[PDB]
Design a binder for these strands. Structure first.
Ligand SMILES: [Mg+2]
Length: 905
DNA sequence: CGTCTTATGACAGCCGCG
DNA sequence: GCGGCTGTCATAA
């Protein structure tokens, strides 16, 4: 009923807009938008417009956008500030939609497609589009259909029609295993020549023009190829037809290495899912191929084919088309799980930006703050250029490398946004400065009180207490939204453990899963039904609860990063509200806050245990403290606990009823000390970690900063059915560590924390024996391939050449001259294996594209010359040496006087 | 989109050192 | 041979 935009675009003096109207139909505008900009004026000229500092401004209405834009630059030639929203697209959206936008996703045309191109030359470069497009699968969210465009005849072979009957059948019948739930949604259309296929695709494109266009590498491959191929056959004008406003532009992306070209389609928002994944998944992956991510996300994988992909359409055209359809579907399957598109939509409409601007936190916040200031008749300052300057960040405590038996951790909730709100940090709320004492003096409360009238930060900054800042006001809206979605997420997590516990002792019956909302804790009535439920329907409930959890994670993690990005933007020279005073004010307050409460926790627990000077806090990073619970348990005596859950319950109550109130009054005192606007430093308990009761097992260990492992029984309110390992920083968490090595090192840790030294020594022995029999990919290292050309000296390694780069140059020599094997792509990742000396390849290592097997033309030699000893030492033994040294254990039993006896019975 | 931030670790190349 | 130094790549916040 209320109308909303789809895409907005500026072309010359006109604004081009696609939108849904009051009746719910998609329409297009061409508006000659008249933009306003502002200039400072004297006190006499009474207006309603004021800048953020309170100074008056006069309004300048322009005849067109060209006039407004060129008024800005000649204001600089005089040397005067040109105020207001210079991005006229954002100005238009704000005027046209001066209310909270409530959109309808069912009316937004979201499309994802993928292309197939047969190429014997090697990789088909989008910039050249030298080879025919032989397949296109295009999914439309409004129709809910997969549109398949098949080429029967090309210079690379004539093929028969694709059979949907064969596609549906299982591999064991000679079928393709195309998921049954999409079979009835496939609209198939074969073509005699490329020109007919490409011409009908454009007609289809006009009839159903995408608003959000997505897919896997659509921006870097699919879109450019379809654009350039149409251009080369039909002409530039016909290629422009992919744009609703017939306007396209080649955009050049250049970073600290090389450059690449993409194609901007005006009037369409392109959200490449590979980029949504990298931004919002919070995972670093060894490979970013669709087959690899699909396997990680959905535990599926694809049916394997014989021969190279360049010969696939020839040998097996049936599978060729089927795989293309499947690939278009898995993006949708990943989105069903992660929900990054819905996230992007909610975010973009809230900020009132082009949907693709979700990739730019600076644009996002610049729009949010502008809209907030516009409501109050206030005028935003001009964007000014600044030199890049370093500034201090968080505090990280230097831990003593040791094992730690009983550990309990605490985190500050939304630290940086909370500091902003507590101290009232904002551009227009700066009051002044005070003489700053050493940071240590504020921590112990020995320094004099900074101000009696203003809200202070230990970096020397003072802020107004009565005035509410734009930044604190707009951040408040976001943090309360995170509290809700994290609440849903944690309840889904808690509900998951109840079900996991029910899978241990199930009841074999024929029933269905219970219809419940997993975002809320199960009631007693639902719990008793779960106990009498079948393992089949329990596994379905578990799948659904975890899927609800993942949906909760996505939402809360995105709000987390967007809020932290506001702090981050303050330290970025391009942000309209760039201010290192405000940036440092935040980080210095945090530094004091962490170290302050460390002192308080140490004081409290010493009084509680009847001792003095004992160091209870062992570690901290930014907003967290890790407390040694050894003494707390010892004061009671661990003989008084009947099982593991007993002492976990005890520390839980100790934290909630004793430590947290003591923490609250500590921070409350600090609030008075800094004279802050409001007390918002709240600390929740996170981990309760320790060994199983009665077992050998070290519970946890630290090796250094950002590197530790814990055996966690309870995390932030969720009581695990089985203890989960919390490992931070260690090699098991790095995408560069081989897959099999990660798994082995994790088991090493698990045995250390839960079972003890003798168990570790046992597993080491067995892994060391069966090491050589592991899949070569699973034991291969991963690294990013940057600056290959920089170290390439006539095919051979130059000075200071990194290990993985040495591998690539070896690979390139091995595949040199032969028509085309898989090529290593600049900027992407590679597998790395060490080679034994004397190998037919030039060097001590080899590298090839990750997520793939090496060429069969070189595979057997690599396997034969693999250096297993160097690989075991570098990737497995050396890291395990690190863990065991820290924990004061041996992974290998040291020589003893006992060796001079015979213990074999 | 290509204009969120700092802190901090491991590891390999190069090179000194009778 | 190992330790200092720097480049590179990765993570924790
Ligand atoms: Mg494809």
């Amino acid at each position: 009923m209320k109308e909303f935009y789809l895409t907005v675009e500026q072309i010359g003096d006109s604004i081009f807009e696609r939108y849904i109207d009051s009746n719910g139909r998609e329409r297009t505008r061409e508006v000659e938008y008249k933009p306003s900009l502002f200039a400072h004026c004297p006190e006499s000229q009474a207006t309603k417009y004021f800048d953020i500092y309170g100074k008056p401004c006069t309004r300048k209405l322009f005849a067109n956008m060209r006039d407004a834009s060129q008024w800005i630059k000649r204001m600089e030639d005089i040397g005067l500030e040109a105020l207001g929203m210079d991005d006229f697209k954002l100005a238009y959206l704000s005027d046209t939609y001066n209310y909270e936008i409530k959109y309808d996703h069912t009316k937004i045309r979201v499309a994802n497609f993928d292309i197939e191109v047969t190429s014997p030359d090697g990789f088909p470069e989008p910039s050249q589009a030298k080879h025919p497009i032989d397949a296109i699968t295009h999914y439309d969210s409004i129709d809910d259909r997969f549109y398949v465009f098949d080429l029967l005849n090309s210079p690379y072979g004539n093929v028969e029609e694709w059979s949907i009957e064969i596609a549906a059948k299982l591999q064991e019948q000679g079928g393709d295993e195309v998921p049954s739930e999409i079979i009835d949604k496939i609209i198939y259309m074969p073509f005699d020549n490329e020109k007919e296929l490409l011409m009908e695709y454009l007609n289809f494109w006009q009839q159903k023009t995408p608003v959000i266009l997505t897919g896997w590498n659509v921006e870097s491959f699919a879109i450019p190829y379809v654009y350039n191929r149409i251009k080369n056959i039909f002409g530039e004008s016909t290629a422009k037809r992919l744009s609703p406003h017939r306007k396209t532009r080649v955009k050049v992306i250049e970073n600290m290495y090389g450059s690449r070209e993409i194609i901007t389609l005006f009037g369409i928002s392109v959200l490449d899912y590979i980029d949504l994944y990298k931004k919002f998944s919070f995972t670093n992956q060894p490979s970013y191929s669709l087959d690899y991510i699909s396997e990680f996300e959905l535990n599926v994988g694809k049916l394997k084919y014989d021969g190279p992909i360049s010969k696939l359409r020839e040998s097996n055209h049936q599978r060729y088309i089927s795989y293309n359809i499947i690939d278009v579907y898995r993006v949708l399957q990943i989105d069903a799980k992660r929900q990054f598109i819905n996230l992007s939509l909610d975010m973009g409409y809230y900020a009132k930006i082009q949907i693709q601007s979700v990739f730019s936190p600076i644009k996002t916040w610049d729009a949010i703050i502008f809209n907030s200031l516009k409501e109050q008749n206030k005028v935003i300052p001009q964007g000014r250029s600044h030199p890049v300057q370093p500034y201090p960040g968080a505090f990280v405590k230097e831990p003593i490398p040791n094992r730690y038996k009983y550990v309990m951790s605490f985190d500050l909730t939304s630290l940086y946004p909370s500091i902003i709100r507590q101290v009232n940090i904002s551009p227009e709320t700066i009051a002044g400065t005070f003489k700053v004492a050493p940071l240590h003096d504020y921590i112990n409360a020995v320094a004099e009180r900074p101000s009696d009238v203003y809200s202070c930060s230990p970096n020397g900054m003072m802020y107004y207490k009565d005035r509410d800042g734009v930044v604190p006001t707009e951040i408040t809206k976001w943090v309360s939204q995170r509290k809700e979605h994290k609440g849903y997420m944690l309840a889904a997590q808690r509900n998951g453990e109840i079900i996991k516990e029910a899978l241990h002792n199930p009841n074999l019956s024929v029933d269905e899963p219970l219809d419940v909302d997993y975002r809320f804790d199960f009631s007693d009535e639902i719990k008793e039904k779960i106990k009498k439920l079948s393992a089949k329907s329990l596994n379905e409930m578990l799948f659904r609860a975890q899927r609800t959890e993942v949906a909760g994670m996505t939402a809360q993690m995105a709000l987390k990063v967007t809020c932290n990005s506001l702090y981050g933007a303050l330290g970025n020279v391009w942000f309209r509200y760039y201010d290192l005073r405000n940036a440092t004010a935040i980080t210095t307050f945090g530094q004091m806050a962490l170290q302050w409460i460390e002192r308080k926790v140490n004081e409290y627990l010493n009084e509680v245990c009847g001792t003095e000077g004992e160091a209870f806090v062992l570690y901290g990073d930014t907003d967290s403290i890790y407390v040694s619970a050894d003494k707390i348990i010892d004061k009671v005596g661990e003989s008084k606990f009947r099982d593991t859950n007993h002492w976990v319950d005890f520390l839980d109550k100790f934290a909630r009823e004793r430590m947290e109130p003591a923490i609250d009054r500590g921070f409350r005192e600090m609030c008075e000390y800094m004279n802050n606007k409001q007390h918002l430093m709240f600390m929740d308990r996170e981990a309760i970690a320790g060994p199983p009761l009665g077992s050998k097992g070290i519970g946890g260990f630290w090796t250094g900063k950002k590197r530790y492992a814990l055996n966690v029984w309870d995390m932030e309110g969720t009581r695990y059915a089985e203890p989960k390992l919390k490992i931070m920083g260690l090699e098991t968490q790095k995408s560069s560590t081989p897959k099999a090595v990660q798994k082995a090192l994790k088991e090493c840790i698990r045995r250390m924390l839960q079972e003890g030294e003798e168990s570790l020594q046992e597993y080491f022995k067995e892994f060391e024996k069966e090491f050589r029999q592991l899949n070569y990919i699973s034991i291969a290292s991963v690294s990013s391939a940057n600056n290959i050309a920089k170290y390439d000296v006539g095919g051979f390694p130059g000075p200071k050449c990194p290990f993985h780069i040495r591998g690539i140059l070896t690979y390139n020599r091995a595949i040199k001259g032969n028509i085309d094997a898989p090529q290593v792509v600049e900027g992407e990742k590679v597998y790395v294996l060490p080679l034994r000396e004397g190998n037919p390849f030039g060097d001590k290592c080899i590298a090839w594209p990750s997520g793939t097997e090496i060429t069969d033309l070189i595979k057997d030699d690599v396997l034969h010359w693999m250096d297993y000893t160097v690989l075991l030492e570098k990737t497995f033994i050396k890291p395990l040496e690190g863990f065991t040294s820290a924990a004061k254990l041996d992974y290998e039993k040291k020589a003893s006087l006992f060796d001079m006896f015979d213990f074999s019975a």
